[PDB]
Amino acid sequence: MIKPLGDRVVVKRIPQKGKVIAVGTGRVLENGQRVPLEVKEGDIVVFAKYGGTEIEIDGEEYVILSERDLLAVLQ
Amino acid sequence: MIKPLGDRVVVKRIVLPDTAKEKPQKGKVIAVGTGRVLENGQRVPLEVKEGDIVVFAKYGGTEIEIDGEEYVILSERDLLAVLQ
Amino acid sequence: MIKPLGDRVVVKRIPQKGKVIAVGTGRVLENGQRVPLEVKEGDIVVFAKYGGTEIEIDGEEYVILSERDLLAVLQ
Amino acid sequence: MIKPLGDRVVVKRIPQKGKVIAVGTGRVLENGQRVPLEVKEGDIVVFAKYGGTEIEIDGEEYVILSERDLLAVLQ
Amino acid sequence: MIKPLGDRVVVKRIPQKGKVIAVGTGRVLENGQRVPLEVKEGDIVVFAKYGGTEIEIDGEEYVILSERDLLAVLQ
Amino acid sequence: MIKPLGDRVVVKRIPQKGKVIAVGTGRVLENGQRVPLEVKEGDIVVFAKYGGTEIEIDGEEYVILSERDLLAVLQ
Amino acid sequence: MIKPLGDRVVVKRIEEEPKTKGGIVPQKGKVIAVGTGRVLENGQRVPLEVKEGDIVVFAKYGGTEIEIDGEEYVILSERDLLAVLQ
């Protein structure tokens, strides 16, 4: 469906709480290695207010966020 | 036709409140660059390919018109996600 | 409960004093290595006033702070 | 004639279109490696409006631009 | 007592003059390497006015400071 | 006379044109390597207008420019 | 006396010569102390390119003013030193 690029994730909104519905491939380091995102689909994350980009698709609103904007996972 | 350089791509873009347009953009990738080069000489290829439908920051990238057709050159960092 | 992401920790507030209750996995370096946080659960850390993110859950308050915001440990 | 220095090129004007007439030796990396420019002479490049340094030589108008300002090659 | 974290030090006040009474583990480089502080306990340092964090403990006042805020050592 | 430091050169003015009369030792890379300046004494270089630092000494005027400010060589 | 830390130097400023058009109409300074230099990501420490005695030219307004014993000095970073006058 939605494939976030790089070090990003797609979350359905609910400090902010959102449900991780899609995760990117993560950040690339200078040595070429690709660091995997630290959150998986399903996870409820807390992110910075006003952080990320709002994106409406099929009446559904999501928020694309960068891993660095993800504060914690609520579990 | 239009060969994007480096870490870029070329996409063909795709009552109520008027501010209902200040939302994201969808485009079709029609050309992709060679991507970014790292301090160790390695070249990281773009993550998108021709055909992909990407979403990108509104007002982002550069508008270029050729033969009456409009295209948008965007850096890989401006591509939010691919819609598939 | 609250899993801090990356180079962060979760503290219970007590300059600001707080008790560390959860610690992230630490910062990732360009060479791929992961640097552990320099604090552990139980530690009483000192952080900059107005620093961090206030989060509330079930009436309890917590502060999500990143390592760079941790000035010192009182021990 | 004009010899662009480093990660630069000289282009005769025509978003801006210009024709590459001279290329530099390219950018130097922190590992001493030198990355050649991605365009060659004769190439028609597109570059950021108001970007680069305008230089007139013998009633002629060129623009000295650095590779990071070259968006694409029109071919 | 007060354990400075990372690239910091705790000085007791006397541009500002203070006595280093505790030093941190220093800054971590992108290759993992850890750079020790360039001052040691006892050093009288000159530091940026309004720089660092004031912390009082048992009627005593201290200043937590980053290595970058330490101008020089008076000796 | 005037020894440019690091990644710099000293030119005598004439987009600005100037004759390179003194060259610095160049930029030091994170790997310890020292990349030499691309220009040499004698070279007429072209640099942005308002760029560089104007220095007067014994009535004679000069300009100190860092390598990143040297756009190209005229020859 | 003063030991600059890191990539710094302590210079005593020098007042420029007065201009006279009948009446009397960038900085210079003497390096008096130099730090150990900048450190690189590979651990290496790059020595400062100036030494004590050197007269250096530096950005006007650049640096930190520190008075010490009625004497004024300027604490500067190596990157702020344009050139040596010799």
Curated annotation (Swiss-Prot), chain G:
Q: Which GO terms describe its biological process?
A: chaperone cofactor-dependent protein refolding
Keyword annotations for this protein, in alphabetical order, are: Chaperone, Cytoplasm
What's the short name of a Pfam family annotated to this entry? Cpn10
Family matches, as Gene3D superfamilies: GroES chaperonin
Q: Where are the annotated coiled coils located? A: none
Q: Which GO terms describe its cellular component?
A: cytoplasm
Principal subcellular localisation of the protein: cytoplasm
Listed GO MF terms: ATP binding; metal ion binding; protein folding chaperone; protein-folding chaperone binding; unfolded protein binding
Entry annotated with the keyword Cytoplasm = yes
User: SMART domains in the record, alphabetically?
Assistant: Cpn10
Q: Which family does it belong to?
A: Belongs to the GroES chaperonin family.
Q: In UniProt terms, what function does this protein have?
A: Together with the chaperonin GroEL, plays an essential role in assisting protein folding. The GroEL-GroES system forms a nano-cage that allows encapsulation of the non-native substrate proteins and provides a physical environment optimized to promote and accelerate protein folding. GroES binds to the apical surface of the GroEL ring, thereby capping the opening of the GroEL channel.
PANTHER family per the UniProt record, alphabetical: 10 KDA HEAT SHOCK PROTEIN, CO-CHAPERONIN GROES
Q: What is known about its subunit structure?
A: Heptamer of 7 subunits arranged in a ring. Interacts with the chaperonin GroEL.
Protein known as = Co-chaperonin GroES
Name the species this protein comes from: Thermus thermophilus (strain ATCC 27634 / DSM 579 / HB8)
Lineage here is: Bacteria, Thermotogati, Deinococcota, Deinococci, Thermales
Q: What's the encoding gene here? A: groES
